[PDB]
Amino acid sequence: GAQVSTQKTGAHEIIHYTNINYYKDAASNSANRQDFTQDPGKFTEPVKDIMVKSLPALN
Amino acid sequence: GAQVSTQKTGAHEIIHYTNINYYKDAASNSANRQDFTQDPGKFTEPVKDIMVKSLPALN
Amino acid sequence: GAQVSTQKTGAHEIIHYTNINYYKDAASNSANRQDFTQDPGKFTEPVKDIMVKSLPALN
Amino acid sequence: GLPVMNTPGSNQFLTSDDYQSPTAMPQFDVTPEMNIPGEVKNLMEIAEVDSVVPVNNVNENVNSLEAYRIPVHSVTETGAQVFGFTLQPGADTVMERTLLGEILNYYANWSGSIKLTFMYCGSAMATGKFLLAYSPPGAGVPKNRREAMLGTHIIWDIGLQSSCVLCVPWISQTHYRFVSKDIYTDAGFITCWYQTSIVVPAEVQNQSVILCFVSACNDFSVRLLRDSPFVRQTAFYQ
Amino acid sequence: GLPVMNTPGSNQFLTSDDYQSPTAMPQFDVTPEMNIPGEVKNLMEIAEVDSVVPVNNVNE
Amino acid sequence: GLPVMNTPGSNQFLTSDDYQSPTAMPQFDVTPEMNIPGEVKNLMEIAEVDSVVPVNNVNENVNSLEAYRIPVHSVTETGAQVFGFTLQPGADTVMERTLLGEILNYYANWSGSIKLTFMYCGSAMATGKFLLAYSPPGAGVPKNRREAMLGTHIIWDIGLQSSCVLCVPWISQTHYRFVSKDIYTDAGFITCWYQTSIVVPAEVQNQSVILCFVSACNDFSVRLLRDSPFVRQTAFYQ
Amino acid sequence: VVRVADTMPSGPSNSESIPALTAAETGHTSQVVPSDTIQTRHVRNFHVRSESSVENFLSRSACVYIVEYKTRDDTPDKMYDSWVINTRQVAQLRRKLEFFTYVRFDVEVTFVITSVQDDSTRQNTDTPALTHQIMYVPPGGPIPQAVDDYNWQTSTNPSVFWTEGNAPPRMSIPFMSVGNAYSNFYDGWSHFSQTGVYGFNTLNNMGKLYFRHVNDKTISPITSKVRIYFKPKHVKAWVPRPPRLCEYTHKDNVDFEPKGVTTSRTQLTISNSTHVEN
Amino acid sequence: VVRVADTMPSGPSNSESIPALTAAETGHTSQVVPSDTIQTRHVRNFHVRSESSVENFLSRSACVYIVEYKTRDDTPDKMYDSWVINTRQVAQLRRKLEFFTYVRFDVEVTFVITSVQDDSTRQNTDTPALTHQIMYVPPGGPIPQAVDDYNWQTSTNPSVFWTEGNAPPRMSIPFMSVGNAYSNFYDGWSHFSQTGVYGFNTLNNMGKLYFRHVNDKTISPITSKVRIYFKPKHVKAWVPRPPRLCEYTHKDNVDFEPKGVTTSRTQLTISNSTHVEN
Amino acid sequence: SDRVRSITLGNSTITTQESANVVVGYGVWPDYLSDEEATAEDQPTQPDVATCRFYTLDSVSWMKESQGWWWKFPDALRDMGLFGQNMQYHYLGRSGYTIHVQCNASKFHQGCLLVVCVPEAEMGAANINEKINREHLSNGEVANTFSGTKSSNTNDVQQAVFNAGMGVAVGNLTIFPHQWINLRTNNCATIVMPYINSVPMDNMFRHYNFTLMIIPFAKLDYAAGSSTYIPITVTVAPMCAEYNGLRLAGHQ
Amino acid sequence: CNRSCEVPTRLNSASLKQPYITQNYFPVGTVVEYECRPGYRREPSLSPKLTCLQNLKWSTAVEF
Ligand SMILES: CCCCCCCCCCCCC/C=C/[C@H](O)[C@H](N)CO
Ligand SMILES: CCCCCCCCCCCCC/C=C/[C@H](O)[C@H](N)CO
């Protein structure tokens, strides 16, 4: 019951690693250091009546 | 997620080894001591108007 | 990339073992203690005009 | 009995590990997760938010709200100036303790463009134009308005839209600069110039105030986790 | 972290072993093998050859 | 609990290992790789490049550019000679500190053919022929021109192509020779002979200079990594 | 792999499109791409916002505390130690966690135990290997009062034994909280009448650790110190928050000395340097 | 497997094809196969240019340095040590790396730690196992100033603990550079006005290591020495370069005493030996 | 015949009739920086043929006992027309180079020259633990001169020919792109260097890219009555130059 | 009582000359000179001198 992922590697010049979970509890697992998603739309642009950025957005 | 290669062996008289990557970073992997390619055409023969080696290559 | 052989066992009364090579060099492997072939025809009978062993082989 | 060879680095404790450990409270029932609004997944979602820059930090205004107030008034001669600082968001004293600069002091490399926003907080009858300029390094600081208009500038006309954006692009030879000071990764200068003047009618206050913001663009990145040079502890807090 | 129990006979050195070891000269280029005549694979190929018996070993 | 037996050679540190280790800076973002021209993948791409041989190393010309200048002039009697050395690219004093010899001193075995190139740097009115000869070992050094023409020689006529190539083949009984000196892997001798003379017109300088090059062929190989006998350190450099 | 956004090429412009003129009065950060004000080129950018994520920012083996106790003392109270668990006596991990208002994570816990032979006349001994016990007491349980107490018999409480010379002790701990997340900041009181204790001290309630030598009383004093290293992992965080300016004073409140905004300057403009000469 | 090239058979020749006559004036190395000047035979050659590759040449556990520090000194400065990281204080690995002008690699780092009991009157002790800390400080971070400094609490800085008797410490380190490759040689200045510092010292900027005993002050002095072993791996190299002739003098420049080209001889020709007799 | 070559750049043209083979680079031809290896964000200045053209440096005189000359080439082209002007207004710049070295004599002359382009030729100081002045490393378009014996001028480069300033064997400098001007048969000293660095663009003043060296291994030698004055002329062109980060005028 | 170096490096083919072989107290910047032992002969490509450095250790001396 192993799972194979990709290793963090450089760009401009897909290596895989293997993983087995040994313990019965999920707090035991190694940390998830490979989630790179983001969504900065709730802190920046946190308004109503969404602006266009080319219009004056006033008057 | 293992990979099987050939071992360095003698000539005139294809043994395999197995490899598993354990860590999440590619700097952790064992060194690549089995790349035997070369191209000495940028240091030797580093000229324009490529010569023939049987002609005098002058006049 | 494992290989399964037979164990050395007694006669008149086919057990298998498993083997994995871990290192990249062939000098690292365990010794080949299971080759039982022979050919004593170059030390004994090392002659020309091969004899019959029932003829006198002379005159 | 399995043949095992221990390799170097056994029985050490490295701080940045990613191993597995046994649980001291096995089969523990963790409480259900709730949708709390405002989740942060990346610290770069925070650094792209505007925060006011304490530009007027001249030797006493630090201990007041006057650090954030940039003076502007009517000048008897144009060709002038307003302010200027050095583009070092975490080394320069101006934008050191800012939101971007304090995220940026836990790191050691940075890359990407930087925004600057200038809200003119004066009267609605007042008007005037400014020269917001960035100068890439290699020469000195410009000393005229005509030396600063050779750089990356924008002329800002004050009107019904009371704020403008100076976008400082990424003009470098390396992919990264240091968040601390070295001479190899100098980054340039930011100056603002009285271009014309402040023109007000009668019975309107001449002396008004500019507020400066700073944030990061959508190509900003930080690289080397270090400890911040601003935390200091002598004994345990009890 | 894998759960491992060491069994008796660990960290000993037995003379007739068949284990694996690391190479001190890695990726070494061994010279090509040559066909030398007269190969011995078994010591019983030697014992089947006639050799003269010192029968008259009487005291001098 | 898995049954494991530790084998001998555990908890040692061998210098030439190929194991895996944990990273102290996990998930580190390495900068993008750039196409820099002139990549070396094998050190034998370097050894096949010509480099000048300090042949005239006679007891004072070492501390000058005269080590590389081989004298040649007009001789009052033919049947003569020009120079000679011993074919030991890393043991012989002549081609010791050369490019091929310094790549070759980090090793302990070598194999393959060796090139020698002779650029005649004299006048364009001068002319003459030489005897470039290699002598495999077993006899002594040849003492005549007629003993040296029994070897592997080429007669070089100086003309509009001002350089020639003496190719020293691989005549051995073993596949490898030692880059240091033992008597079991002796390799032969390289001599050059005034064959005829140097013939010049009037008001042209008689005494000219040969330059000698050395490189390796496309079947050259080195085998045993050792440390070079030329590095020497007494204390740390600070 | 989620790369950063790229730079697109642009040219001259003369139109009624004004991206620079914005309104910062509407709580709104402008999103000016650098290709909107200057003429740019095509940059294919290969950078990753990898090591700035909240996991990669918080999942380092930080600390919490140092603990001292002896193996031969005349007073029976310095022969063992204890620690009420918070994360607020060391300022680095406290400031890093107080970037956010709510957090939720599992903890990986490591101990680093070092023993020093104290000073006495009979200092030349032959001491066997010291063995340590670290017992965790959940909130409300019974507390030890000596080293030979029978409350150390750890029948239900989780305890860890360690022998001198091995790898350090490490164990993982799940999300041990009664709310949906941990609270870095609590703006309220303990009693419903708005009296009592104010702040985050109402919500700590983690229990405490107890430390002793498993061995009997030695013939010479040895002091042992164990350092509790906290390391968070599997992290989520909510409603971010400005970094703290002032220095911490205590572990149970947010009280501070008023510090100025930043470092000072001598004048409001920049110029070239006026030091020594050409 | 890429074997070396083979030798082809040939015969007599009398033609206008002249492979020996070349022009070395055109920057060009001639490629004369040995089957072009002499008559050869068919040699099927089975040799491999394996152990001359740049990986097989550089990936050996070389070194960089020796470090000394004590556990009981009256001066508080010799109780710990430090080292600014370069690769240029030992000449063997420096010369080997300076075969090339640019390099790019990962580093595998091993420490070899040995402790010697110093000389004192009270030399008969019973000392438990020493424990060491090796902390790495990235370029710009805060530096310790004592052994009991609170800057050693390694909350963000990577540090390694080691106990006497185990396997040596070893950890891998990625390509930690701000340019596209490392620089063995830099022909320039630090300041734009062509003043300042000259050479490769502008581009080192690696941070530094700090070394101490984790234990408290012992009753007798013990000096520990740790040897930093650098070992490169995953290697690429660009624009090769001649081997250095002269001896190194310092670690921050390329300054040298002028050495002659090679070893001398007594005459320009060879002959048979003139020693003793038949 | 292949002894003849024309080289055309901008509004400048070099014709040679005793070329041997035009030597050109590491195999790589110079080209503009791609936008997949680029770092700076604003639009580059590919100026015109106004920089991509030949400039002639000063002439050095080759005597019987001359030892060798050297230049530093991003710095040697610092007053050479609009090229140098772009150096003074931009922070980052980048170019390959076509170096063509000329020298001529008669057929009664003899002597041989080595013309090497050495990347990152970091020179060593004459007295060991002491600073070097910039005027001793690069003197603009004016050559610095090696010596035969060791030198001990203060704040100066160690200038012996048999160590080439750097501390190596001078017969090992044929590992770099080079030619020989044998006066018997040559004049064809091209080296078309590409851009070689460890960063995609670099500063022209703070960094020296490479070093041209002209070292006579077989010295100049002639009979009495021939022309005793033999000059050596070095002509250099930038190729595919581009500039980035425009600001005020720079460091003279 | 200034800072001093140790005894210079004992080479197995060279001995010190005779102002230097007896006297102790080598300050910094001190050059000492070796002579060929009997029976040896000089290698001309090496200079038989040793300077003591700032860290009170001599320069590298191998085989003169
Ligand atoms: C026998 C070994 C058991 C070790 C027990 C030690 C730790 C157990 C307590 C759980 C740790 C909780 C981590 C900190 C909680 C929150 O982050 C703080 N309240 C900050 O808001
Ligand atoms: C806590 C253990 C961390 C150990 C840290 C030690 C090494 C970290 C620094 C990186 C080593 C870089 C290797 C040398 C760099 C280049 O090759 C040199 N500049 C030569 O050009």
Swiss-Prot record, chain J:
Tissue specificity as recorded in UniProt: Expressed on the plasma membranes of all cell types that are in intimate contact with plasma complement proteins. It is also found on the surfaces of epithelial cells lining extracellular compartments, and variants of the molecule are present in body fluids and in extracellular matrix.
Residues annotated as domain Sushi: 3-64
Record note on modification: The Ser/Thr-rich domain is heavily O-glycosylated.
Disulfide topology: 5-52
Annotated glycosylation sites: 2
Role: This protein recognizes C4b and C3b fragments that condense with cell-surface hydroxyl or amino groups when nascent C4b and C3b are locally generated during C4 and c3 activation. Interaction of daf with cell-associated C4b and C3b polypeptides interferes with their ability to catalyze the conversion of C2 and factor B to enzymatically active C2a and Bb and thereby prevents the formation of C4b2a and C3bBb, the amplification convertases of the complement cascade.
Family per record: Belongs to the receptors of complement activation (RCA) family.
Subunit field text: Monomer (major form) and non-disulfide-linked, covalent homodimer (minor form). Interacts with ADGRE5. (Microbial infection) Interacts with coxsackievirus A21, coxsackieviruses B1, B3 and B5 capsid proteins.
Domain statement: The first Sushi domain (SCR1) is not necessary for function. SCR2 and SCR4 provide the proper conformation for the active site on SCR3.
UniProt disease annotation: Complement hyperactivation, angiopathic thrombosis, and protein-losing enteropathy: An autosomal recessive disease characterized by abdominal pain and diarrhea, primary intestinal lymphangiectasia, edema due to hypoproteinemia, malabsorption, and less frequently, bowel inflammation, recurrent infections, and angiopathic thromboembolic disease. Patients' T lymphocytes show increased complement activation causing surface deposition of complement and the generation of soluble C5a.
Protein name (database record): Complement decay-accelerating factor
Name of the coding gene: CD55
Residues of the full protein shown: 94 to 157 of 381
